[PDB]
Design a protein around this ligand. Structure first.
Ligand SMILES: [Fe+3]
Ligand SMILES: [Fe+3]
Ligand SMILES: [Fe+3]
Ligand SMILES: [Fe+3]
Ligand SMILES: [Fe+3]
Ligand SMILES: [Fe+3]
Ligand SMILES: [Fe+3]
Ligand SMILES: [Fe+3]
Ligand code: NI
Ligand code: NI
Ligand code: NI
Ligand code: NI
Lengths: 169, 169, 169, 169
């Protein structure tokens, strides 16, 4: 085995590889959304900026897990990254609703990975998930929830969507 | 009695203790409102900021009376602080209407305390009420009145409430 | 339910509302102590400063839980804040002994809330309690213990209390 | 009469002349105390500084009334300034107790002058007394009360008086 590996269970190693793929998928969904909102017939630069930054964050989440895998002596296995579920995302509100669903699926996966770590008595891994991932996720879900509520108040279509979009820009 | 006490009547001492409780109550009502407006299903950061600052001010009003009580040789008696009348405050307009009512009840209490001070010929206390409390109160009532009028013009629901909220932020 | 709520159990939600009330109560006890030590017949400005700052901290503890409740999609329920147990706190040593007891009751409550979170497998909440509350509490108990020992050495009455009070100022 | 005099009653004019004399007397008492505490067999520089500054303040109080008399068109009548009641003031505590008594006699006189102004419906004069004199007096009485309590805790004789004196220095 790896000269560094200690108290690192093969189920946790595999779970992190799966989570790496899921973070990359989320990054690619947000990339899709970002450029969707730069179409000449959509033209919502605030939403475009928001989802470009979210896409960058999700890739950084994947890279931190990849670093973590090496840190513990596990081995990174990269799998294909699925095409995003949609090619066109609808309104700003529909994109945020899609993002909220995705963030909660990722949160579900992170909490399941915490349970795996915890059942294998790996406090280094539960600590990683708590400090680096679980709060970022809860904060992100609250933020997107806030945005959905604000957009519904502002608009959520037409004039109000235009003005809300400037808030994000 | 206190070595410092001079021309300080027991009815004024008791009236200030009651006013201390009322200021703290107002601070707690505004604290309630502040975090109500940070709910993911409310999300009005301008209102939240406005009522957080108002809550801080009301606690400062209470502390200034507590300092005053000691300054005159009276003795602070702290009583329980009632729960705020509501747990959920409705729209921004409804919260401002509630604040306006509360500010006028506090103003009524301050004017009654001025009458007590005046009937007991305590010019140090009437001067305190005039310089430190009565104008802050009249200015606050005018401000909240202005905000209600502006919000009714802007909205007061939906799109206009969203845009008015940015004014406060 | 809240659009943001995920893995947030109703017993944890209720426990946080109770803890919010308890933090506010502790803030109000310390407010009482702070101004007690500014009485013309007490006049211990070091103790007064110490308990004013402690009162501010406890309100900040309450506000952080209120923010946390919203962050997770729970709903803040505010209850009446009990009057402090005493109106007059005795010597500086007696106030510190009272503070030590209160800090340990709060610590007990925080540890019980950690057990609730842990039994409901809420690692986001156990992480909150560990990083934001449990160390602040242990550090505060050590500090107050140190102060009690120092005051007993310095005095704890009369001349030594006067000189110890300058340490705090 | 004076070309400027308006709504200025002769009883208020005379009362201010008497108060001018009383402020000067208080300044001279404090001058006495100040240099008493610089005797080679007393040597309390903190008390000496405190009473020098108090003596300066009391002369400034007299000069402000003299300015006020001219401002209203009254005429300053200066009378002899009595010798201080003592030549030797005892301990620091005894001097503070003497100062507290004197400050309260001055406060009594100021409140009587406010009643005179008020009975003659002179709001310019009641406002002068409130803003320029009555709070300075209440603050001074609280300060001296605090000092007496602190000195009694610190000492009030011997070692503790020596150490308390450094607080004032
Ligand atoms: Fe992620
Ligand atoms: Fe995020
Ligand atoms: Fe107030
Ligand atoms: Fe106000
Ligand atoms: Fe606390
Ligand atoms: Fe603490
Ligand atoms: Fe004076
Ligand atoms: Fe003075
Ligand atoms: Ni659609
Ligand atoms: Ni309603
Ligand atoms: Ni006792
Ligand atoms: Ni003597």
């Amino acid at each position: 085995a790896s000269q560094v590996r200690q108290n690192y269970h093969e189920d946790c190693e595999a779970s992190i590889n799966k989570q790496i793929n899921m973070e990359l998928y989320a990054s690619y969904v947000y990339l899709s959304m970002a450029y969707y909102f730069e179409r000449d017939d959509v033209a919502l630069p605030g939403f475009a900026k928001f989802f470009k930054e979210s896409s960058d964050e999700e890739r950084e989440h994947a890279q931190t897990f990849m670093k973590y895998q090496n840190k513990r002596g596990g081995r990174i296995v990269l799998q294909e990254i699925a095409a995003p579920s949609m090619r066109e995302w609808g309104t700003g509100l529909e994109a945020l609703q899609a993002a909220l669903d995705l963030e909660k699926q990722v949160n579900q996966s992170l909490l399941e990975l915490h349970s795996t770590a915890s059942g294998n008595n790996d406090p280094h891994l539960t600590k990683l998930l708590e400090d680096e991932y679980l709060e970022e996720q809860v904060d992100s879900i609250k933020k997107i929830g806030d945005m959905i509520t604000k957009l519904k108040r502002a608009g959520p279509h037409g004039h109000g969507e235009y003005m809300f979009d400037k808030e994000l820009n």
